């Protein structure tokens, strides 16, 4: 009833990617930590994981 991922038997999401219900939205004015975090969200969802440094 509480705290179940969508998908039933396949209600799983590899920890390399974002938690299945998280959203990330760009706002015009936001802190630089939020800008960083949204950048890792983009890399995390397009490339499926965090790139190595560089």
């Amino acid at each position: 009833s509480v705290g179940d991922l969508p998908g039933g038997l396949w209600g799983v999401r590899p920890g390399f990617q974002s938690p299945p219900k998280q959203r990330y939205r760009w706002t015009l004015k936001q802190s630089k930590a939020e800008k960083e975090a949204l950048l890792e969200a983009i890399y995390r969802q397009v490339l499926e994981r965090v790139l190595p440094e560089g």
Partner: protein, 160 residues
């Protein structure tokens, strides 16, 4: 729950919990006995809460239990009282959890569609939640009354 919310916010950033979220969890776990006593108090007196709340709701909105109303008849009034009991149980769940996540995920998502399908008036739901809030906060001390009233306000806003 508070713990799950902090862990999920930290997981959404792929980092360990910051000092602020750990402060949040310490505050949650230090208040555990108080909210456990409050939840036990609400559970012990569930019958009185449901009975007084039903009485107050049917006094303030008599068309629900008059002919043609959604809760008209003994069986439908029993169904009305039953899901007032549902929402009291969810309120105790949300109190022990420390947030409205159990309430939200068991009783709030798709609640307007469910009560649309069931022909249940939604302002009637809001008025029932307010009546329960008055009765349930009557049984508690002021500090406990305010915290429980917040959860009941979350229900009232969710239904409205």
């Amino acid at each position: 729950s508070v713990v799950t919310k902090a862990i999920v916010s930290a997981d959404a950033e792929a980092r360990y919990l910051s000092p602020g979220e750990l402060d949040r969890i310490r505050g949650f776990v230090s208040s555990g006995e108080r909210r456990l006593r409050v939840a036990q108090t609400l559970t012990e007196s569930r019958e009185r809460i449901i009975k007084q709340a039903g009485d107050q709701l049917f006094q303030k909105r008599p068309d629900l239990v008059s002919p043609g109303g959604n809760a008209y008849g003994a069986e439908r009034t029993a169904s009305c009282l039953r899901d007032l009991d549902y929402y009291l149980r969810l309120v105790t769940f949300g109190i022990v959890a420390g947030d409205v996540t159990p309430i939200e995920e068991i009783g709030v998502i798709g609640v307007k569609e469910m009560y649309r399908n069931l022909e249940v008036p939604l302002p009637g739901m809001v008025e029932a939640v307010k009546a329960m809030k008055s009765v349930a906060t009557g049984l508690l001390s002021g500090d406990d009354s305010a915290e429980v009233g917040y959860y009941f306000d979350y229900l009232a806003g969710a239904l409205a």
